[PDB]
Ligand binder design. Structure first.
Ligand code: SF4
Ligand code: SF4
Ligand code: SF4
Ligand code: SF4
Ligand code: FES
Ligand SMILES: [Zn+2]
Lengths: 687, 90, 177, 85, 48, 118, 271, 92
């Protein structure tokens, strides 16, 4: 705690601050190009130079600590001269590219020049020219605009964990990038664009299409991965133009994965825009809403209760599942699955059963992490970056299952389920390794829990946790975590739907937008299928009736995070064509079926939700639970027999994991450009 | 060659190509692509060339500088304002 | 200004009057119980509140013979900071609260492919210096509100000396393989 | 000189490189000259060794081999070999 | 007279409808079998 | 300097001068210019839509001053009287043919105007 | 073990180069990868005497070589097969009574891919439950491992059967490399490690090889002669091996022009 | 004791909603923390949903066939009266 002076006003800061940090906290804005709040401190540019008395040379605000009693004069003429000189040197070799540069209208170079520069040039010689490089279909390069700020190199090294970028050469002829012709293939690759202050690196799908001033922005959350990444959607009229990350510091920090950023263009094609009916020969005809609802209502009134089933889709929100559950309960139906295998063997009795009890930030708190059938590099790239940051700070990672090329170091305990049995039964060194750890943490992927012995694996994991001390009241620590793969499954668990209640033979199936893991043998050949959906890749080919619905960006809904956080997805554009809201369709069908539901707007539906579970009305919040040890208690006499089969992951192609991503053009381009290069049957022993 | 193949996309800035160049009279409402393709490559002696798109300043486009010292010798480069293409002489 | 009256900060409880809400009276009571009693800029839990079409909503000018759709709408109140594309804009953001209304109809008329709004309202956003001002405006004009609270980047220790650290003794053996 | 890798048929990835046993003894001596955790400090000497045994120039494959030997990224070897004239 | 080509393209810029199967088709149980409409090549299923 | 009917110009090679920078769209006080851009398959950035509502335009010339490649201009023509309101919805075909018809006079005038500072 | 001889001294030297995959390994990398393969087989209850059929095309040079050395380390017998129809594959499975089958799914056999032929021969693979053992008409068949990219029910990927064992926390063991253990059944003749080593040294003496001449193996590398003069020769003596499977002689010549006195093998036959 | 051995064919779900720390939900919280596994073992398939919120009132919601619900207020109820309330709820 020391006293400094900024433009004559005394202020109190901490002795560990830099001048830039003190100025920003005191409301003073200092121009900068190379400093970033999350990367290491570099002082290559000199735009943050300020003037301090008794110090002859200008001092870089970002790379200099504060001194007790010092005075910073950011409004003196000397500071103006320093900024003008630095801006002049920066613009001496910059190309006249603003009309063709995608950074125009949001370039920090432009704004800083306008506000702080001299305002005119005197350089009258040839500028340097740099040949462009090819980094892939996601990043476009125009290297005449680079100012050698090292932000991309520092981001790649310290955040992405990849070591492909650098600075080769010397003097003015030095160049930023890879030495050889190599693509910048990685998850979180597009993030580097947001880091680069100039148009040197640009969003290749978002090439030439838009300008910053003709866009309207909305705040929402992502559903492509079970981490509810906070995102900003920029649109122009009825067209969504781009997706950017936001700041949360508890989710995704500042960063989003490439699927979150780019797979939104799968909403522009393969869309279902009107209700349809399929004939016996397979012909599809567009019909009215009234006719479709009347047909389904007749089927509901005629079909026996035991022959009715449902499938819950990957992108199913709380309101839709509440509506369907209430309607089928009114119809005396308690089965919400018809698929024989692939069901999660987790009881929805307690919230701690199926949630991330240590939250996303828990990777920073734990010292030993054990992945069981989990591949964070593909299932949660931002969580993978967080784990990498933590492993740089004394976090040890062990893995049971398929060995993966994580950008950090992990110890392979084994491949099959025999390692887990050895750990649970003792006589394995990892039991003592867990016992000596301060805060042990176990992350089991949801995929490993749809094994035919998923319940036995769950019981074995509970036994291991209770024996080692992953769950302990003395430490007030709950290290048991499940990394889910579908948002709809999380919402169904939160509402209280048992995933293991399966109708063996159903003659009337409501498919609420489920396309993954769908095979023709699951649905009987003599059944009646009603598919609620937005895309026509799968499920729409099983359906006698197809009802168009609204995507996640086309409705106001509530989504539960994989750590238990309740979030609002907000309407950005109305659903195309004749599509309708899921709960509105279900309510209309219930009214036409003689069992109307007691809600007519979103407010009354949320009142019903509050009747079911109040915690779903608290947004951007996680409700604490005090039943962790009761829920995860190692029960006596429960089966713990595991098949001698290796534990694998569920993702082959990262860029295409669902209908929206499958209907995307940039995802197909990324697949074509990166799948052959990223595929390997051997471990990269360098990392 | 398939315009959707890996090689064609990679050597076309990851865009679907059009050798006939006749899709642009509908998509872009003009035949400028054909006309600019009718102009041959200009061979320059030095390693860098300056383009202004005309005989004088303000008649054309802002001064731009194009590098001709490429990783592969003699690879032509295109001005990003005007469609003219240049290559280093031999 | 961003950081600065009790009634404006008070969130009224819901009273069920519709038959549907009379059916779900337990849910209404639970929502009244769990929702925050008062709203302040220091809150962390966002919330949705219905419009209060009592005597207090008399100051609206948007209830005309041709317009019966503006009053009773639910706005969104949040802070919109500078995006992740630049750091030093000439006009900075994040110094005010934004009240926003969701779109109601957007299409393209076919004669020239021209973008058209089916609802002239909600085209632009409304800006207030304080959250209390936005909530007071909503209460005056008979609007409900979805209040969400800002998320800010944490403070961290930065120094150039962190770039040059001793790796340690060569004898530091890692027993974790 | 160009601060990038020129496309050359005789300087591709298929071009083989391997240190001689005498150069391997020199390599172990050089690594003995430096601390255990600072093997990358031997990048500059080893480069000379390459330039000794391959006609006064350093091929790309030799730089990849050096990167593998010193347990350092190839990009750092690229930067070191390009920085110094 | 060719107004529909312009209208359809403007509609398809932001919402391209899914082409429904027409006429008699091939059935495997209840699923209807058609060829994919992707112009991109799934090279990882033909590569080796 | 007379501000008449709008036109889109070309380089002497026949290439479009307009690079879809959207400066003219934001410069318009009447919001009469609508632009949409896609990358042309050869890679250059060009407009897929460039239209001006001539019933919204105030004929102020702010757009031709904003253009940095002299692509959009106001020509000398004033005899543009139309019988239908739809004849005044100018699309890219109309502006391009206006430029291709009025190019000599526009070139002469712009040549003199350019030489004036010199 | 003899196969670790080059590991004893100068394990940093380059051992093998896969030209078709642009992959170069040192002796340490090759040893680690083959150890991972052996450990992965051992974890799945593979003992001495188990048979592993190989139905793999030429482009998977590294996979084949790693499988061969891992089979040598783990004590399981390797048996290559050459099938072009469902009947041939069924006959091979019946004759060998193999416990596993390592294959490349995208390879062509007539008009159908390898994975399609496998599913035709074994109709139980499609309906096999997730994480459950195989229940086929074949007695000892337990594992279908493929080198491909996607996931097929009832089968496992090649990378999912690799256990990169650690210095600590390792509870497995690897049996000693026995010289008399069978390793290769091609053309109704059995081949153990001792016979392969003898063939290696005899061909070295006849063709005038030493520790300096590289060896270019092209085409199919499953032949015992290719194994003897390739990776086995590299492990025994330190010669450089270059695998150029599924490349025509023009590309092979363009690669071999960089080497001096290279000995070229085509489909296990000296050219 | 015999009431909890078998769940009636009309009962479909027993949902418990209460508070984490309020003295109002003290009895129901303690009852759930002590007798959950006793009911779960005898009915391994029957759902027993437990949800808690910061200020929620204690409720024991019983759901029957055809979507019939019967919600009972369980505030300031000790172990015996919670037992009796649940017994009566599972009795109709
Ligand atoms: S990066 Fe682009 S917009 Fe920014 S000043 Fe440079 S050329 Fe102009
Ligand atoms: S390409 Fe851009 S972000 Fe990267 S170092 Fe250059 S100026 Fe900085
Ligand atoms: S101002 Fe000129 S260069 Fe820019 S979008 Fe308009 S016509 Fe094109
Ligand atoms: S002359 Fe003025 S009003 Fe007319 S289009 Fe140009 S900028 Fe708009
Ligand atoms: S911002 Fe301080 S030197 Fe770059
Ligand atoms: Zn030019």
């Amino acid at each position: 705690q020391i006293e400094i002076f900024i433009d004559g006003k005394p202020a109190k800061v901490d002795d560990s601050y830099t001048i830039f940090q003190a100025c920003y906290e005191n409301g003073v804005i200092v121009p900068r190009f190379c400093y970033h709040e999350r990367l290491s401190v570099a002082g290559n540019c000199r735009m943050c130079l300020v003037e301090v008395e008794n110090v002859p040379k200008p001092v870089a605000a970002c790379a200099s600590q504060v001194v007790p009693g010092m005075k910073i004069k950011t409004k003196s003429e000397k500071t103006r001269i320093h900024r003008g000189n630095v801006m002049e040197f920066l613009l001496a070799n910059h190309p006249l590219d603003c009309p063709i540069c995608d950074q125009g209208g949001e370039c920090d170079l432009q704004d800083i020049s306008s506000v702080y520069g001299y305002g005119i040039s005197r350089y009258n010689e040839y500028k340097r020219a740099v040949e462009d490089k090819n980094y892939g279909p996601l990043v476009a390069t125009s290297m005449n605009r680079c100012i050698h700020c090292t932000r991309c190199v520092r981001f790649a090294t310290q955040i992405a964990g990849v070591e492909d970028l650098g600075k080769t050469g010397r003097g003015k002829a030095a160049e930023i990038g890879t030495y050889v012709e190599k693509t910048f293939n990685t998850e979180l690759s597009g993030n580097v664009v947001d880091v680069c202050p100039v148009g040197a690196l640009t969003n290749a799908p978002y090439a030439f299409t838009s300008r910053p001033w003709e866009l309207k922005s909305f705040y929402t959350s992502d559903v492509f991965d079970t981490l509810g990444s906070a995102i900003q959607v920029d649109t122009r009229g009825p067209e969504i133009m781009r997706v950017l990350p936001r700041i949360h510091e508890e989710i995704n920090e500042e960063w989003i994965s490439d699927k979150t950023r780019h797979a939104f263009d799968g909403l522009k094609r393969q869309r279902i825009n009107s209700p349809m009916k399929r004939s016996k020969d397979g012909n599809y005809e567009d019909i009215f809403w009234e006719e479709a609802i009347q047909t389904i209502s007749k089927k509901c009134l005629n079909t026996p209760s035991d022959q009715i089933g449902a499938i819950i889709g990957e992108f199913a929100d709380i309101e839709s599942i509440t509506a369907l559950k209430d309607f089928l309960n009114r119809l005396d139906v308690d089965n919400f699955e018809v698929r024989q295998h692939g069901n999660l063997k987790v009881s929805p009795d307690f919230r701690a059963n199926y949630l991330m009890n240590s939250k996303i930030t828990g990777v920073e708190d734990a010292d030993v992490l054990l992945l069981v059938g989990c591949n964070p590099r593909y299932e949660a790239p931002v969580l993978n970056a967080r784990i990498l940051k933590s492993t740089r700070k004394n976090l040890k990672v062990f893995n049971i299952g398929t060995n993966q090329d994580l950008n950090y170091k992990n110890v392979h305990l084994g491949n099959s389920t025999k390692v887990l049995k050895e750990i649970a039964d003792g006589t394995h060194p990892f039991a003592e390794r867990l016992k000596k750890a301060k805060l042990p943490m176990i992350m089991v992927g949801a995929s490993a829990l749809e094994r035919e012995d998923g319940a036995e694996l769950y019981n074995t994991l509970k036994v291991i946790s209770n024996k080692t001390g992953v769950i302990s009241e003395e430490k007030s620590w709950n290290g048991f975590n499940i990394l889910h793969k579908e948002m709809g499954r999380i919402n169904a668990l939160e509402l209280g739907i048992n995933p293991t209640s399966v109708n063996k033979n159903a003659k009337l199936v409501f498919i609420l937008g489920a396309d993954n893991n769908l095979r023709p043998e699951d649905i009987p050949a003599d059944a009646f299928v009603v598919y609620f959906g937005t895309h026509g890749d799968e499920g729409a080919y099983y359906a006698d009736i197809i009802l168009p619905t609204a995507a996640y960006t086309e409705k106001n809904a509530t989504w539960v995070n994989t750590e238990g956080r309740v979030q609002q997805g907000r309407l950005v554009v109305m659903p195309p064509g004749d599509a309708r809201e899921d709960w509105q369709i279900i309510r209309a069908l219930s009214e036409e079926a003689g069992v109307p539901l007691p809600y007519d707007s979103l407010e009354e539906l949320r009142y019903r939700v509050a009747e079911l579970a109040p915690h779903l009305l608290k947004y951007d919040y996680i409700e604490p639970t005090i039943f962790g040890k009761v829920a995860l208690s190692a029960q006596q006499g429960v089966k713990t027999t595991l098949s001698p089969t290796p534990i694998t992951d569920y993702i082959d192609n990262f860029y295409m994991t669902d209908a929206i991503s499958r209907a995307s053009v940039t995802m197909a381009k990324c697949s074509t450009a990166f799948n052959h290069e990223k595929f390997s049957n051997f471990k990269n022993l360098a990392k | 060659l398939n315009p959707y193949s890996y090689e064609a996309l990679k050597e076309n800035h990851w865009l679907v190509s059009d050798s006939s160049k006749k899709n642009s009279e509908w998509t872009h409402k003009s035949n400028a692509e054909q006309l600019i393709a009718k102009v041959p490559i200009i061979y320059v002696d030095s390693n860098i060339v300056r383009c202004i798109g005309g005989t004088e300043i303000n008649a054309g486009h802002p001064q731009v500088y194009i590098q001709l010292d490429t990783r592969k010798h003699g690879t032509p480069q295109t001005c990003k304002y005007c469609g003219l293409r240049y290559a280093k002489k031999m | 200004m961003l950081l600065p009256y009790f009634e404006i900060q008070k969130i009224p409880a819901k009273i069920a009057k519709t038959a549907n809400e009379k059916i779900l009276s337990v849910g209404v009571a639970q929502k009244n119980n769990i929702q925050p009693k008062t709203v302040t800029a220091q809150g962390q839990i966002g919330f949705v509140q219905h419009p209060q079409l009592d005597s207090s909503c008399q100051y609206t000018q948007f209830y005309t013979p041709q317009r019966r759709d503006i009053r009773g709408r639910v706005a969104r109140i949040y802070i919109q900071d500078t995006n992740h594309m630049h750091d030093t804009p000439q006009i900075p953001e994040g110094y005010k609260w934004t009240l926003e209304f969701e779109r109601q109809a957007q299409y393209k008329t076919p004669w020239m492919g021209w973008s058209f709004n089916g609802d002239t309202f909600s085209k632009r956003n409304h800006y207030f210096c304080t959250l209390e001002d936005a909530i007071s405006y909503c209460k005056q004009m008979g609007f409900g509100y979805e209040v969400s609270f800002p998320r800010s980047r944490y403070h961290t220790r930065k120094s150039y000396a962190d770039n040059m650290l001793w790796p340690g003794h060569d004898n530091a053996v890692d027993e974790d393989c | 000189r160009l601060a990038a890798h020129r496309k050359n048929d005789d300087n591709s990835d298929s071009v083989p490189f391997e240190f001689t046993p005498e150069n391997y003894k020199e390599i172990e001596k050089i690594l003995a000259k430096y601390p255990l955790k600072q093997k990358r400090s031997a990048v500059m000497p080893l480069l000379y060794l390459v330039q000794e045994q391959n006609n006064n120039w350093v091929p790309l494959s030799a730089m990849k081999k050096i990167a593998k030997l010193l347990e350092m990224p190839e990009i750092d070897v690229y930067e070191v070999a390009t920085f110094y004239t | 007279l060719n107004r529909m080509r312009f209208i359809t393209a403007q509609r398809d810029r932001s919402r391209a409808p899914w082409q429904s199967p027409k006429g008699e088709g091939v059935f495997q149980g209840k699923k209807l079998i058609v060829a994919s409409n992707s112009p991109f090549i799934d090279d990882m299923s033909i590569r080796d | 300097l007379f501000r008449g009917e709008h036109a889109l110009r070309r380089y002497p090679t026949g290439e479009e001068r307009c690079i879809a920078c959207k400066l003219c769209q934001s410069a318009c006080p009447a919001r009469a210019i609508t632009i949409e851009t896609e990358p042309r398959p050869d890679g250059s950035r060009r407009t897929v839509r460039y239209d001006i509502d001539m019933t919204k335009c105030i004929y102020c010339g702010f757009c031709q001053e904003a253009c940095p490649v002299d692509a959009i201009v106001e020509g000398p023509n004033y005899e543009q009287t139309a019988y239908l309101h739809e004849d005044l919805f100018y699309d890219k075909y109309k502006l391009l043919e206006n430029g291709d018809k009025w190019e000599p006079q526009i070139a002469r005038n712009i040549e003199y105007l350019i030489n004036q500072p010199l | 073990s003899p196969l670790a001889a080059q590991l004893a001294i100068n394990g940093n030297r380059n051992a093998v180069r896969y030209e078709n995959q642009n992959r170069t390994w040192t002796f340490n990398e090759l040893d680690a990868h083959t150890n991972a393969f052996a450990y992965g087989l051992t974890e799945l209850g593979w003992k001495a005497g188990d048979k592993l059929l190989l139905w793999v095309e030429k482009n998977h040079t590294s996979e084949i070589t790693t499988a061969q050395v891992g089979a040598a380390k783990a004590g399981v017998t390797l048996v290559p097969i050459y099938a072009h129809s469902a009947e041939e594959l069924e006959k091979a499975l019946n004759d060998t009574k193999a416990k596993g089958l390592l294959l490349s799914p995208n390879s062509k056999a007539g008009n159908s891919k390898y994975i399609e032929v496998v599913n035709k021969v074994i109709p139980e693979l499609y309906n096999t439950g997730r994480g459950s053992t195989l229940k086929t008409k074949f007695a000892n068949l337990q594992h279908i491992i493929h080198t491909g990219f996607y996931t097929f029910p009832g089968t496992y990927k090649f990378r999912q059967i690799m256990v990169y064992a650690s210095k600590n926390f390792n509870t497995l063991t690897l049996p000693n490399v026995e010289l008399n253990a069978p390793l290769f059944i091609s053309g109704n003749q059995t081949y153990t490690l001792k016979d392969l080593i003898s063939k290696t040294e005899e061909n070295r003496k006849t063709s005038k090889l030493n520790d300096n001449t590289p060896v270019f193996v092209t085409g199919d590398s499953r032949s015992p002669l290719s194994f003897s003069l390739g990776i086995l020769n590299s492990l025994l003596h330190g010669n450089y091996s270059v695998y150029t499977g599924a490349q025509d002689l023009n590309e092979v010549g363009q690669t071999i022009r960089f080497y001096d006195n290279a000995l070229l093998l085509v489909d296990g036959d000296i050219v | 004791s015999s009431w909890q051995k078998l769940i009636g064919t009309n009962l479909r779900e027993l949902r418990f909603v209460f508070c984490q720390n309020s003295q109002r939900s003290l009895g129901l919280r303690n009852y759930i923390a002590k007798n959950y596994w006793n009911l779960k073992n005898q009915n391994p398939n029957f759902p027993l949903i437990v949800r808690e919120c910061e200020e929620a009132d204690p409720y024991i919601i019983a759901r029957y066939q055809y979507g019939v619900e019967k919600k009972a207020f369980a505030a300031n109820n000790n172990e015996a009266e919670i037992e009796n309330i649940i017994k009566t709820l599972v009795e109709q």
